[PDB]
Amino acid sequence: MKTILSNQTVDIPENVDISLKGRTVIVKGPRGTLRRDFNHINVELSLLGKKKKRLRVDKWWGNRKELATVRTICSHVQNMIKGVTLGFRYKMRSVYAHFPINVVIQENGSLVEIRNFLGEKYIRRVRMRPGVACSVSQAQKDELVLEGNDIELVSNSAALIQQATTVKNKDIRKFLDGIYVSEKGTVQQA
Amino acid sequence: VFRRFVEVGRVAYVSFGPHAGKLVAIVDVIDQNRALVDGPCTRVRRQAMPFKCMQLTDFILKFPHSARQKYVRKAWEKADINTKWAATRWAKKIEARERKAKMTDFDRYKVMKAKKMRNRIIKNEVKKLQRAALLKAS
Amino acid sequence: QVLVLDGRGHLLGRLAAIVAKQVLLGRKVVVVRCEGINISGNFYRNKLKYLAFLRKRMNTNPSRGPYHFRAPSRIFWRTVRGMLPHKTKRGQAALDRLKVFDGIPPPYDKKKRMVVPAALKVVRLKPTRKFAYLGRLAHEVGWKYQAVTATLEEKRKEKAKIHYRKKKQIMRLRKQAEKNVEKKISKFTEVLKTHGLLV
Amino acid sequence: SHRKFSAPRHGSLGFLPRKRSSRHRGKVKSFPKDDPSKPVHLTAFLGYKAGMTHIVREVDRPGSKVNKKEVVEAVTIVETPPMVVVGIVGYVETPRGLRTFKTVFAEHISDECKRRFYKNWHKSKKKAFTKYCKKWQDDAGKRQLDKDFSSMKKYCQVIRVLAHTQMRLLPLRQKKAHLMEIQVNGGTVAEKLDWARERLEQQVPVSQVFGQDEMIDVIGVTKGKGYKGVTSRWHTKKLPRKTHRGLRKVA
Amino acid sequence: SGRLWCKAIFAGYKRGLRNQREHTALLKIEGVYARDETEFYLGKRCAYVYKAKNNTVTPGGKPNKTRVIWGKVTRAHGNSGMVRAKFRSNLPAKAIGHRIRVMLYPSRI
Amino acid sequence: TKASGTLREYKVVGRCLPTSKSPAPPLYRMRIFAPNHVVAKSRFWYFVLELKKMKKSSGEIVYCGQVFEKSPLRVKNFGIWLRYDSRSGTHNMYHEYRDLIMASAVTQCYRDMGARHRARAHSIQVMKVEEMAAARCPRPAVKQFHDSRIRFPLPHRVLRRQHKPRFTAKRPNTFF
RNA sequence: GCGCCGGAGCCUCGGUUGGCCUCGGAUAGCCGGUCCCCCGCCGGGGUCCGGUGCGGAGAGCCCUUCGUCCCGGGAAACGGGGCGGCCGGAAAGGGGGCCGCCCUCUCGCCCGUCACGCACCGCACGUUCGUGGGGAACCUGGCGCUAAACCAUUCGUAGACGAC
RNA sequence: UGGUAAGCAGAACUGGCGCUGCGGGAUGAACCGAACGCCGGGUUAAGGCGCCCGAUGCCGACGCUCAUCAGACCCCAGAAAA
RNA sequence: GCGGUGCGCCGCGACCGGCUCCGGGACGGCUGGGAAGGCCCGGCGGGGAAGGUGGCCCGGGGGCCCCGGGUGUUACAGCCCA
């Protein structure tokens, strides 16, 4: 049927100040401003209370699959706020059997050189999304710490250095080599 | 972002149909796309009416959803919607549109000759306002 | 006596059906900004649809066969062509009245260009139903001059902005030049208002 | 029924229209892509196939079986006397493609170039560019010539230079020189047009265009062989000797 | 001084799909786009004015080149302000999409 | 029965004609939702022949008046019990509507059964129509209008009258 | 013996019968203002103010035209009308807008006076664009322009023949 | 009725086609409507009414459906189990 | 002057009759001697619950005004029945 109204409030923290031009939300706080446009989604984004301490997304006369988009907007703005209060840290770990994978970073964090993967001579230069800073952390044999604000960008660039390290024309159950996303967390904690 | 809402006791202008150019008050919402409506003071009988033919205004007045015509007529005359309508710019340009359609051929001559002189006396002053725009840069 | 129609945010066949009928009634229709014309259903369906059109060629000599015009204009021209008796003289005398453009060239850049709200995407599609741009569809199927059209379109948007900035600047000096003079255009204003040209 | 044994198709359908080239001089269909970072340069020249001879050089490619061994390579000699720049043409970039905006020719055009503008030079009074020449030696003309360059460094985007071959310096029978638009690829359009105007009535030698050990694209017309059968034109199989109506055709 | 006729387009003949009845024409009068609005135009005189090579006599003047086929708007065609008209000569198909002048000369107002 | 336009409810009473054995046969009443009295009296004989040894030949119709609404200006909740033939088997349904009129809910039912299950009105037998109290109405599409404080906007006002200009000079507004 | 500029008409092809000179565009959002802080070389971002079944409305606006005379009242004097320049215009370059004068009126526009003009006697192609498009010649004054192609011959980078 | 079936072969009843135009089914001997002297007006059938193409350019009613192989009208011109 | 006949060609009007398609008024019949509804005051009396009004309690929105729960029969709204 058509549900007359489905809606969902995001309880935003005082550290953050969100505003919206139409349904293009902006989220700024401690460590930068994130903007995500929702021109495609077709909802009523209302910002209520003095000092704007909650975002409220309404969907009038939505069918089942259009009611599904209410929480997905709510979840993005939650992820937009975690990404500005706390940031996003994807601690991901190089697994290898015999050949150690030499991970060295260029371009002050923007590009990762991947060498010696299955003892291959081809060196793989995988770029990060604009606003993700990859690094090699301390007291870790095999570790890439990806850091950025936008979860969309940090995670997409984590998937790039995982799908770069794909074993072609072998059993991938014996050959467990490659750099895999080992942990999804936040840069500065709660 | 919406301001006008289909609510119990919202006055809505009826755009077209049998009761075109009248104010009906939403008594009860029947369906997804149809409302029980009454206009006791604008001579619209208690009846069903679809949302597609009604342009909802910024006049809400308090009566219950079940309320019979007697208690819609009271809240209507109490609010005094028929005068607050005629005051509204919406209703002022409805009667302008009416007057323009009922403009006689002799009535059209008088407003041709009026406009003409009314437009000359501005287009003089637009030319004079614009010499003051030129002069202040020299 | 010449309809200049804008193509931005109009549906392809919906506009063609309304252009073709005007053009058969001896009306010179100029449809302008054809890269703006959009087609209902998601992009990849409409790309497939047009790629399936390219595959249709006269096996023994393709030079004779169906001419696959790439320009958004000439795509739009052809869908109007398909809604005309273009083998008769009245249907050929028709098409000549139709004049179709990518972007918006001289004559019809400094002219007020109409809209067909019964052929208009926002009116006629649900906002969940996906659509394709005839600009993008044309580009990704062999139309070369997308970015040349786009830079020459961005030029005249800035040039037409100067005009609008100047047109607002008169309208303020009209509204102010009405406010100064209302004591000696009173009896004229009154009688525009008793016949509802202002109220 | 099916092709019994699969063989590939005789000849390419790329150059299908196997006709007399409508031009005798090889048109440059595509010039290199210009980036405004580079300094200005001509991107094409116009030479003459003199002949063909050996070379002997020592090859220098490591790993090969001819590394630090001498080879004998076949080479062509393209005689390329320096070309005289006699005009500049501007191109406006349009949504119907790329339109020629304005041509400005030089003041003094040599009779090598003039010959190109006549079918019968002998019968002609040789009047070409005699009223155009007058634009360069009056104040009222120089004004409107410099307003053409001004107009062209505003709207035009692709500047090509007109350079004709210096036919007198060759051993050939003909005197009618070959004109050619050669695209100037370089910096900004302003720098490109100041430069081409500076080169107007100048020799451009081939060292100014090309350098040694440079891979270049040679454009010309193929050596003409007249009306040929399918066995010569397409290199199809010759049919059996016992063929009645001819063994030199497609069955 | 001014125009005393309303702008009509000779859209085509009264036809089926595979049969046309040339005796009745289908006018498209400018402004009227419903059977409601076409009540005014019924019984009105309408002229296909054209001009030919030879000077034909003009009533109330000297011979011009301009000629007429005088018609009459008979009734409302279709649902959308189209109108049937019937001419003293079946109109030539030369005039399909060309201007005919529905006059207010048989007034009822 | 062709469910032509808005249906009417007809109270049709009819009795098997008086035999010597049965001088005073019992009268049988029905609720026939039909376009008009001529097809209401046909649909009477359809159902009464399925329930009794009674044909139009061995019987007569004694009264066929339209039952009118005794509250046509009150919005009510109608629970309609169906019996319709699918393509593969016949099925019982309970169905809930929200109209001013009984016949209108049963009208609204015939359209819906066509819309959702492609049931033509000949397939459908209506066996029970009942006005229900809000608290006894299970289907959630009808319950969502049991709201004293009902409040929704008319969000995306897709303008009709698309051919009044046909050629305008303004993109139309769909935020009213 | 033809190109640019400046009377009396002949044909021939016809259609038409006031102009709109331009924001971008959004659509679960707009539009116009705006003083106040901000960046920008006057353009943007806010703020607040209005408008929003678009009235700074294409349900729109602009032009609206029997004509002339005399005399008033508004409106105009920064106006109107044609002569030397200043200042504008590439996607398929245009009729614009400015200040200066040689400049002619105090007429035009809106009311109200004074009456006059084939008032052709009830009647159709009337009223425009239009000194339209095209083709011939007839007059006339400036400013001026003195070519080439094809054949023939020749070549052989070409070639059945033309062509090249 | 024979035959796996067939635009196959063979019967019953009635109506068609053949002998027959006409409106509709884009196009068809037979389907659908309807049978014909030559014409004007009116009205319909069966079918339709975005444009081709006469007619929805009604502010038609309520749903249903998204297909990267949509679906779209007797005979009829392409699909099943799952 | 009347009766009859015609107009050189191109047109117009008028009233009358035939057939038409429309439009606008006004009158009456029938019904469950329509059903609902309007207005008298929701008439004195008793009754029920809810898509629950006020009041009260709870949750916090605003500079004391407003909403989201809870309780429940008229209250500072109405509704259904006898």
Side-chain angles (χ1 to χ4, degrees):
Chain A
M1 65 281 199
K2 294 288 188 180
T3 300
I4 180 164
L5 176 61
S6 80
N7 49 8
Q8 182 171 343
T9 52
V10 186
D11 280 309
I12 71 98
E14 185 60 26
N15 209 154
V16 171
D17 181 64
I18 72 169
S19 73
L20 46 97
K21 184 179 180 184
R23 82 291 273 287
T24 305
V25 307
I26 70 93
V27 174
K28 65 183 65 166
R31 52 176 286 157
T33 85
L34 285 182
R35 314 174 61 266
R36 205 183 193 284
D37 187 12
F38 300 108
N39 278 328
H40 52 85
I41 213 66
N42 197 210
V43 295
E44 178 188 50
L45 299 192
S46 294
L47 186 69
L48 66 97
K50 180 174 286 294
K51 302 176 184 174
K52 309 298 204 284
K53 292 185 292 179
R54 60 186 66 188
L55 181 60
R56 198 265 306 284
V57 42
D58 305 277
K59 184 68 177 80
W60 304 99
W61 302 109
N63 60 309
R64 194 174 179 284
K65 294 178 87 283
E66 288 297 303
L67 300 178
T69 65
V70 173
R71 185 172 156 100
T72 207
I73 300 157
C74 165
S75 286
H76 289 319
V77 176
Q78 282 179 349
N79 279 314
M80 223 173 304
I81 282 165
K82 179 179 259 72
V84 166
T85 43
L86 311 181
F88 279 96
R89 188 201 290 280
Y90 274 35
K91 283 178 180 183
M92 66 187 285
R93 288 185 57 72
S94 168
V95 187
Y96 65 82
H98 193 278
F99 296 110
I101 303 167
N102 186 191
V103 177
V104 61
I105 63 173
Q106 302 291 124
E107 302 281 304
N108 53 54
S110 294
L111 183 135
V112 168
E113 309 255 338
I114 297 164
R115 300 168 177 276
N116 210 140
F117 168 79
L118 271 303
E120 280 189 335
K121 296 299 183 288
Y122 179 50
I123 67 172
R124 275 195 304 281
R125 300 183 181 173
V126 184
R127 280 199 77 76
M128 300 312 153
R129 305 301 297 167
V132 190
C134 196
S135 57
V136 171
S137 82
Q138 293 75 11
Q140 299 297 330
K141 191 182 95 281
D142 294 311
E143 192 68 58
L144 287 81
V145 168
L146 285 158
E147 292 186 341
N149 290 339
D150 195 357
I151 189 174
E152 292 286 356
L153 302 183
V154 174
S155 58
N156 189 46
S157 47
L160 277 180
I161 45 174
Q162 187 170 357
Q163 282 187 335
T165 73
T166 46
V167 181
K168 305 303 193 299
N169 293 289
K170 300 292 175 66
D171 191 9
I172 60 163
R173 294 179 290 117
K174 182 66 71 180
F175 288 6
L176 298 169
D177 300 352
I179 310 167
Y180 303 101
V181 175
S182 81
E183 188 279 329
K184 303 179 179 182
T186 57
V187 177
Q188 59 180 6
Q189 294 82 17
Chain B
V1 318
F2 306 105
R3 289 169 285 103
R4 279 79 178 280
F5 294 88
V6 173
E7 207 271 298
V8 169
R10 185 164 290 276
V11 180
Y13 179 78
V14 189
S15 177
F16 58 87
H19 302 286
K22 295 180 184 169
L23 294 180
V24 297
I26 296 165
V27 175
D28 203 337
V29 180
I30 298 166
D31 211 55
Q32 197 273 345
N33 50 16
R34 195 171 61 181
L36 194 269
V37 101
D38 199 336
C41 221
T42 51
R43 302 168 298 160
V44 180
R45 205 184 304 278
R46 174 66 68 92
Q47 61 186 294
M49 215 179 70
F51 291 126
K52 293 179 92 289
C53 83
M54 43 196 285
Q55 300 183 346
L56 71 168
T57 72
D58 54 348
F59 295 125
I60 49 169
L61 49 96
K62 189 165 72 79
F63 61 90
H65 62 89
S66 318
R68 75 186 174 80
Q69 177 172 341
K70 193 168 196 185
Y71 300 115
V72 180
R73 189 193 291 277
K74 275 171 62 175
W76 192 285
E77 292 172 10
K78 182 168 178 62
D80 192 11
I81 296 295
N82 281 315
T83 64
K84 284 205 299 193
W85 179 244
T88 316
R89 299 200 70 178
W90 191 340
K92 281 193 296 184
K93 57 198 153 229
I94 285 166
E95 95 86 25
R97 201 169 297 166
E98 292 288 318
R99 280 179 174 183
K100 190 174 178 167
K102 296 296 185 289
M103 199 187 305
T104 324
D105 186 57
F106 174 49
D107 280 330
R108 189 171 307 103
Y109 175 78
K110 292 192 284 184
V111 184
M112 178 265 286
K113 288 288 193 179
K115 262 166 49 183
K116 193 203 303 178
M117 201 63 217
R118 186 248 206 284
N119 288 324
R120 294 299 179 84
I121 297 164
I122 301 165
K123 198 174 262 72
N124 284 126
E125 280 277 327
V126 174
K127 207 165 287 186
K128 287 187 280 189
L129 260 69
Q130 277 183 315
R131 200 185 65 77
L134 186 71
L135 176 58
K136 290 179 74 179
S138 297
Chain C
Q1 68 272 27
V2 186
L3 280 178
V4 189
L5 310 184
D6 205 328
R8 210 278 323 294
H10 281 75
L11 294 168
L12 184 267
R14 291 283 184 190
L15 179 55
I18 296 179
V19 164
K21 193 53 179 181
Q22 285 301 289
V23 157
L24 277 173
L25 297 164
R27 196 74 190 282
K28 292 175 183 183
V29 179
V30 177
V31 186
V32 91
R33 301 181 61 195
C34 290
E35 66 267 15
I37 295 166
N38 44 32
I39 302 170
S40 56
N42 55 310
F43 182 69
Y44 192 78
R45 284 196 85 259
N46 300 119
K47 191 178 177 178
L48 255 44
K49 193 166 264 64
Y50 197 91
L51 285 171
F53 172 61
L54 294 186
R55 289 195 287 93
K56 291 158 180 59
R57 58 199 183 92
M58 182 160 172
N59 191 28
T60 57
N61 190 15
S63 75
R64 285 167 165 275
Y67 302 125
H68 309 295
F69 284 93
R70 260 66 172 199
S73 58
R74 299 305 311 280
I75 289 167
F76 178 77
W77 184 83
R78 196 199 170 80
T79 178
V80 180
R81 203 269 285 268
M83 302 176 190
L84 282 162
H86 69 95
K87 304 288 182 76
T88 67
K89 292 292 187 186
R90 73 178 286 267
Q92 283 180 37
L95 273 168
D96 296 333
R97 300 191 197 102
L98 174 61
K99 197 176 286 186
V100 193
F101 295 104
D102 302 313
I104 258 223
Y108 346 77
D109 63 31
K110 296 169 189 180
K111 284 189 184 169
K112 200 171 282 289
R113 80 293 306 265
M114 300 298 112
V115 171
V116 185
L120 195 63
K121 187 263 290 179
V122 71
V123 180
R124 182 61 74 161
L125 254 58
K126 294 188 197 300
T128 60
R129 300 284 170 252
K130 292 189 170 58
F131 60 98
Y133 296 122
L134 188 55
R136 189 190 169 185
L137 172 61
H139 167 74
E140 298 187 25
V141 94
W143 187 45
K144 298 176 194 174
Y145 311 117
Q146 189 204 37
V148 176
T149 311
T151 50
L152 288 173
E153 196 67 32
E154 187 63 23
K155 272 169 87 284
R156 69 154 279 278
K157 284 183 204 304
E158 295 164 27
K159 197 180 266 74
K161 182 71 76 173
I162 295 160
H163 166 73
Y164 188 62
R165 186 171 301 120
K166 285 178 92 295
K167 194 169 180 180
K168 285 164 71 181
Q169 198 268 337
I170 300 146
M171 200 67 213
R172 289 176 282 178
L173 299 179
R174 194 194 186 77
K175 292 287 97 165
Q176 207 280 301
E178 285 178 20
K179 195 167 73 75
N180 290 337
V181 187
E182 63 187 319
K183 199 168 185 176
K184 53 187 295 294
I185 56 165
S186 63
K187 293 185 176 175
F188 300 113
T189 296
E190 273 151 28
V191 297
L192 267 66
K193 281 182 76 74
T194 59
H195 300 91
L197 294 189
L198 252 78
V199 179
Chain D
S1 74
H2 68 80
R3 181 68 169 283
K4 193 174 182 69
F5 300 103
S6 53
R9 176 246 144 69
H10 289 281
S12 173
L13 296 173
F15 343 60
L16 177 96
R18 285 194 72 148
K19 60 182 287 185
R20 279 82 162 277
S21 186
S22 65
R23 72 285 312 253
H24 179 85
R25 171 182 55 79
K27 172 181 280 289
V28 175
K29 303 295 183 62
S30 301
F31 288 98
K33 289 293 296 299
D34 56 320
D35 48 338
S37 60
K38 286 186 172 182
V40 290
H41 49 78
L42 269 73
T43 51
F45 214 72
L46 204 53
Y48 298 86
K49 190 172 174 180
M52 176 104 66
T53 183
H54 305 98
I55 228 64
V56 184
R57 71 189 190 84
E58 187 175 11
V59 169
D60 187 35
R61 70 181 76 193
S64 79
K65 208 166 83 288
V66 77
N67 186 28
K68 300 179 172 181
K69 304 299 181 184
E70 292 164 349
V71 291
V72 177
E73 307 287 3
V75 299
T76 58
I77 297 90
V78 182
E79 186 171 0
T80 49
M83 275 198 288
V84 181
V85 168
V86 289
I88 42 92
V89 61
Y91 286 97
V92 57
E93 192 86 53
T94 76
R96 296 183 292 174
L98 188 133
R99 194 181 70 77
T100 168
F101 176 69
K102 194 164 297 305
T103 312
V104 166
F105 286 86
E107 181 179 350
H108 305 296
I109 301 162
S110 182
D111 283 323
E112 291 161 339
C113 178
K114 304 292 285 288
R115 275 172 178 281
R116 181 52 59 189
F117 304 123
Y118 295 105
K119 292 294 179 182
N120 202 313
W121 172 259
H122 172 65
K123 195 68 73 74
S124 71
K125 304 300 181 73
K126 301 166 188 67
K127 294 295 291 182
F129 293 96
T130 57
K131 301 182 174 170
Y132 187 87
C133 188
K134 296 293 165 65
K135 294 185 177 181
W136 288 86
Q137 59 268 12
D138 60 339
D139 290 320
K142 287 179 184 293
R143 281 188 192 183
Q144 292 299 323
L145 258 289
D146 285 330
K147 284 182 186 175
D148 293 349
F149 285 97
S150 297
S151 184
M152 192 147 49
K153 67 174 283 183
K154 192 184 289 179
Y155 302 117
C156 154
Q157 305 182 17
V158 177
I159 295 159
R160 300 191 180 150
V161 84
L162 283 164
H164 73 82
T165 50
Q166 218 168 10
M167 193 63 71
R168 182 180 62 79
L169 297 178
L170 299 165
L172 275 69
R173 184 169 180 283
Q174 78 164 333
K175 299 160 186 183
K176 177 186 285 202
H178 290 109
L179 264 74
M180 184 190 173
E181 289 179 14
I182 305 165
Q183 183 163 302
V184 185
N185 288 341
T188 189
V189 172
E191 184 169 18
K192 195 168 285 184
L193 201 54
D194 289 322
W195 181 90
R197 180 165 163 74
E198 183 186 0
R199 293 300 197 285
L200 211 65
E201 304 173 11
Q202 294 288 99
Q203 307 298 135
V204 178
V206 202
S207 51
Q208 295 292 327
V209 178
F210 294 112
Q212 190 178 340
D213 53 63
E214 180 179 351
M215 302 292 266
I216 73 159
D217 312 342
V218 179
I219 307 160
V221 173
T222 281
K223 186 167 72 170
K225 301 175 187 309
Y227 209 117
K228 277 294 184 183
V230 67
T231 315
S232 292
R233 192 158 92 142
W234 291 103
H235 301 94
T236 55
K237 190 61 62 178
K238 291 178 72 167
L239 303 173
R241 294 335 245 294
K242 323 175 44 185
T243 310
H244 169 34
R245 299 168 200 285
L247 62 88
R248 201 72 115 85
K249 55 188 67 181
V250 166
Chain E
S1 295
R3 192 187 81 224
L4 269 304
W5 52 265
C6 337
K7 297 182 163 182
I9 307 163
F10 171 41
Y13 299 101
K14 170 185 176 162
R15 42 111 55 94
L17 177 49
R18 305 172 186 76
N19 288 308
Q20 83 178 6
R21 298 294 190 76
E22 302 97 340
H23 53 241
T24 301
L26 297 184
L27 271 43
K28 185 163 191 60
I29 307 162
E30 185 178 7
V32 32
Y33 306 112
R35 285 188 79 90
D36 318 330
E37 306 301 306
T38 193
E39 294 163 24
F40 176 85
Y41 294 93
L42 304 191
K44 292 296 185 290
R45 188 157 292 103
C46 56
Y48 173 57
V49 184
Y50 63 108
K51 56 186 69 172
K53 181 177 177 177
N54 304 314
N55 298 109
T56 58
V57 290
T58 301
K62 293 184 176 180
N64 312 325
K65 288 195 186 298
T66 183
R67 304 190 185 186
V68 281
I69 303 171
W70 286 108
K72 183 203 268 79
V73 174
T74 52
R75 63 168 177 161
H77 189 72
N79 223 167
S80 183
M82 211 69 68
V83 100
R84 301 180 207 268
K86 186 173 288 297
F87 286 65
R88 289 180 163 172
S89 175
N90 301 2
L91 285 178
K94 188 176 190 198
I96 307 288
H98 284 290
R99 176 53 37 76
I100 86 139
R101 305 178 186 178
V102 281
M103 327 226 145
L104 358 134
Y105 113 91
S107 87
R108 263 180 298 124
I109 297 176
Chain F
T1 171
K2 132 66 131 33
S4 49
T6 183
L7 284 306
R8 296 94 166 284
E9 192 187 350
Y10 285 99
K11 187 179 72 168
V12 187
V13 313
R15 56 89 158 272
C16 178
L17 40 74
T19 111
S20 200
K21 165 275 122 165
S22 185
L27 284 89
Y28 291 116
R29 178 168 66 87
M30 287 210 74
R31 297 162 63 83
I32 305 297
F33 295 92
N36 57 327
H37 71 99
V38 180
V39 321
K41 284 188 294 189
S42 172
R43 290 302 297 172
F44 177 75
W45 290 126
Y46 172 77
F47 288 127
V48 169
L49 155 120
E50 291 187 327
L51 296 173
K52 305 292 178 170
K53 294 291 191 173
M54 200 183 296
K55 292 156 63 176
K56 190 167 67 61
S57 304
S58 69
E60 65 187 321
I61 300 162
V62 179
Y63 175 78
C64 180
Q66 181 181 356
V67 38
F68 313 123
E69 290 301 318
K70 66 177 292 176
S71 61
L73 304 183
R74 285 184 48 251
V75 62
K76 304 172 287 294
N77 318 304
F78 290 99
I80 306 174
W81 285 264
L82 277 289
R83 179 189 194 284
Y84 92 102
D85 307 316
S86 302
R87 294 169 191 175
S88 53
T90 99
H91 293 88
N92 295 305
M93 288 189 162
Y94 170 80
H95 257 289
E96 202 113 45
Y97 299 101
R98 190 168 147 73
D99 208 291
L100 301 187
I101 291 210
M102 209 142 219
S104 252
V106 177
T107 309
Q108 189 179 340
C109 188
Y110 278 117
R111 272 90 181 98
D112 177 47
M113 285 300 293
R116 288 192 159 81
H117 310 291
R118 277 83 173 91
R120 299 97 211 286
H122 69 80
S123 314
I124 299 159
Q125 301 180 20
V126 173
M127 71 176 65
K128 199 176 178 183
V129 189
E130 183 172 326
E131 71 187 30
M132 329 230 71
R136 327 219 26 49
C137 292
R139 315 296 193 211
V142 183
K143 309 198 71 44
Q144 73 181 17
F145 295 94
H146 305 334
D147 190 2
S148 178
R149 310 201 158 148
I150 187 159
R151 292 182 183 174
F152 59 90
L154 300 169
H156 189 273
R157 298 286 279 169
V158 44
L159 93 151
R160 301 296 169 184
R161 212 187 68 231
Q162 295 174 6
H163 296 91
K164 183 62 171 64
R166 194 202 263 287
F167 309 104
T168 187
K170 46 163 64 160
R171 301 305 180 109
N173 191 41
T174 169
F175 194 83
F176 296 109

